[model samples]
Target chain A: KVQELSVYEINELDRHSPKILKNAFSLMFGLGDLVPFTNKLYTGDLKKRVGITAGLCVVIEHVPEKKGERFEATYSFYFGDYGHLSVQGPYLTYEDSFLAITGGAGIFEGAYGQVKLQQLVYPTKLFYTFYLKGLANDLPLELTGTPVPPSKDIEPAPEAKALEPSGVISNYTN
Target chain B: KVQELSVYEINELDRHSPKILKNAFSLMFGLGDLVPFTNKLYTGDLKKRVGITAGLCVVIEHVPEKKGERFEATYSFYFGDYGHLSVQGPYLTYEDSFLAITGGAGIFEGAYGQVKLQQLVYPTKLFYTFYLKGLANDLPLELTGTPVPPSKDIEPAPEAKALEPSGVISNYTN
Candidate 1:
């Protein structure tokens, strides 16, 4: 026969094992809380809430999450404009991640280069091998060996300084 | 007697320094492994020697680093396919240090929406925030909790089925 125990009995039993505290953060992104809508929400709220923290840290908004609260398109809009059928995936650890995504990656076909922020699949992890196709604005001629000597011969020569103005701006009249 | 220590003895003494072994990662990305690039043959030879065990995981190719090793650009190729500008910073990071970039704020005009990538520049640290402007595609309802529920009545929908079985082999009058 099943015995009905008082709420006080359940609480006293909880103190025996390792005390584990769960918060609202856990409630929102926890495995069981997500309401997977068949129609889908594109604002990245669902994806980002899992381990990744985003947006301007200058502003922190309290997000109310209900158990099985479904997120449709309007829910996504409240966060940011969403479009572009982009793919969202898990963020594995670094050594596999980029220490950070320093530059935007894309095709540089036009004269001014093409970089779509929406197209940028924001890196979710840190320590990744990044390779960009277009030319770097200031590409470092990095040293290639141990005890590498500074390339003083190619240093900013005095003549090179003569090719330009001294800090102050000097615009010539046409 | 005059005392002098051999270089190997000095190296052995160097290993005993408490901070030395502790900050190996910091030392790596900090004072970069100075390497000399002699010739194409030498480059090919070095590649053959370098392997996985070196512990150096990240290899950022184009980012400009130190002061003297800074960027140099010209307007001759301005707006040309060959010229571009980008954030050139450190590539690797250790436990205490990270490859943090300063700036890369820009925008893109898309077919339906606009995209903006803003660098969240904190005095000592560099982070980024994405600003977007457009209509959210997935939203089919008003999300604001102002009046609680939308006044409009939602059309009741029936469970959807696959393509309705084509009506009995079209025998309609011409």
Candidate 2:
């Protein structure tokens, strides 16, 4: 039987934040730029942090002739030791998108479904609604626990300081 | 309600044909090998030639200890002006595999389903049956048109010429 699993993710891109493992380069808006991220996942709300997500998004298309920005992303959301749910697909940066729920391991064995993404706070936080199918029946109780409200103490990160000039700048004005 | 949309694909990896844009390396079987392909799609048979598919499959796993070959593929199917349908998944080269229908654009907007792949001709051609759901109702008439029988005029390409030797060889027998 098919089931629905919804979760939230807070992808803090701030320089000081520990969530982002590697901050390779600032957004160049060019093709082939790799953006790797590992962020925290929450259940229903931003307060109760549960699992983590690790993946990379490659800039596939970003020119005028080919419409708008598109990314080929391969990422997975881990629910503690219960297992990880893998996802892959084209991510349209300008709008809300749905990613394909590829096969998974552990409790989510042979999993297939759709991951609906809605930007709660653009470019930083996202609300994901998962439409799961072919999942194992023996689900852990922690996954289906009561939703927690947002924490007032938790606040956004401050702006990052400017860095010194690095290498050559390709396809740009002087 | 969910619906099914099955189709056939003839991915001729012949060097003579214009289908393959870039043949960087001929199957190194190494990690991070990029295999890009643009193949033709048909209805019930291979003669129809309805649309084309363009995507890249990256070799993620290719060690003897880690089992057989595996690829993380991100690709889409374009049914002419009717827009395109996107898919993503982990492709196991040894057996029949299923890919998730993430979402799409044009008539296939908000589409989600599974793409079951069976190789009709090993390492060359594939038969893809798409189980489509949440697709737009106003599908183009050309997509559901009559299927034509296979043509005798079309034939496979001959063996490609030996490529020039370049770069240092890594992980090989003497």
Please tell me which predicted candidate would have the highest DockQ against the true structure: 2
Q: State the C-alpha lDDT per candidate.
A: 0.16, 0.56
Evaluate candidate 2 by giving its C-alpha RMSD to the native, one decimal.
13.9
Query: For model 1, how does the per-residue alpha-carbon lDDT over A132-152 read when each residue is reduced to its tens digit?
Result: 222223321110112112221
DockQ of candidate 2 (2 decimals):
0.10
Winning candidate number (TM-score)? 2
Worst window of 10 by summed lDDT in candidate 2 chain B: B165-174
Best by lDDT: 2
* Candidate 2 wrong stretches, greater than 4 Å: A14-31, A63-68, A138-141, A145-174, B1-55, B59-74, B78-142, B148-174
Candidate 1 structure quality by residue, lDDT tens digits, B1-174: 111100000011212221211111332321211221111000011111100101111121112343111101000001111111122212222111111111221111220111122211111111111221222232111111122121122111111011122211112100
Task: Pull out the clashing pairs in model 2.
Answer: none
